[PDB]
Paper text:
We crystallized P. aeruginosa Tse1 and obtained excellent data, for which experimental structure factor phases were obtained from a Single-wavelength Anomalous Diffraction (SAD) experiment on selenomethionine-substituted protein crystals. Subsequently, the model was refined against 2.6 Å resolution data. In both structures, four molecules per asymmetric unit were found which were virtually identical to each other. Both models show excellent stereochemistry, with 96% of the residues in the preferred regions of the Ramachandran plot. Since DSB2 was observed in the highly redundant SAD data, collected at the selenium peak, its absence in the native structure is unlikely to be caused by radiation damage. However, once we excluded any reducing agents from the purification procedure of native Tse1 protein and setup crystallization experiments, crystals with similar morphology as observed for selenomethionine-substituted proteins were observed suggesting that in those crystals DSB2 had been formed too. Thus, we argue that DSB2 formation or not is not an experimental artifact.
Most importantly, the T6SS from the Gram-negative, pathogenic bacterium Pseudomonas aeruginosa was shown to inject at least three different effector molecules (named Tse1, Tse2, and Tse3; Type-6-Secretion-Exported) into the periplasmic space of competing cells. As injection of effector proteins by the T6SS would also cause cell death of siblings, P. aeruginosa co-synthesizes the cognate immunity proteins Tsi1 and Tsi3 (Type-6-Secretion-Immunity) and shuttles them into their periplasmic space to confer resistance. Tse1 adopts the fold of N1pC/P60 papain-like cysteine peptidases, which are widespread among bacteria and of which homologues were identified in eukaryotes, phages, viruses, and archaea.
Residue numbers in the entry: 3 to 150
Amino acid sequence: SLDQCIVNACKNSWDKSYLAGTPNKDNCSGFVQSVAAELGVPMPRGNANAMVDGLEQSWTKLASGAEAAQKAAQGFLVIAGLKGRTYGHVAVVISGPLYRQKYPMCWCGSIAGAVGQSQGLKSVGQVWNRTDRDRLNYYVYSLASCSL
């Protein structure tokens, strides 16, 4: 798999602060912004909801969670996003085996603390709860970030 460069961007981003005095581990939107900036990918800005509005407008949607991991394995940046009535959430999908044969591995920060956070060993199915996890949208960037 080709996602090593995406995984490195995640590791470096974890301790950065996109927002002043707010570590990226406590801010899902900020975390994805730092990941995107290292990879050189223009990313819709704002909070999670605002980010999802932008991804819906300008990024290709993937069919399934299974497909998202394949595209990640092929070195594409893939964002998992879902709007809330109050607050949404965003995560970076990485490659690897699928939890419960459905839900891809991911990296994400969260204001919720450890329960919301993932460093690549929680799936999206362990970050979002049992009702939200089957509602997820997976967006892929037009160009692969990692090469050979």
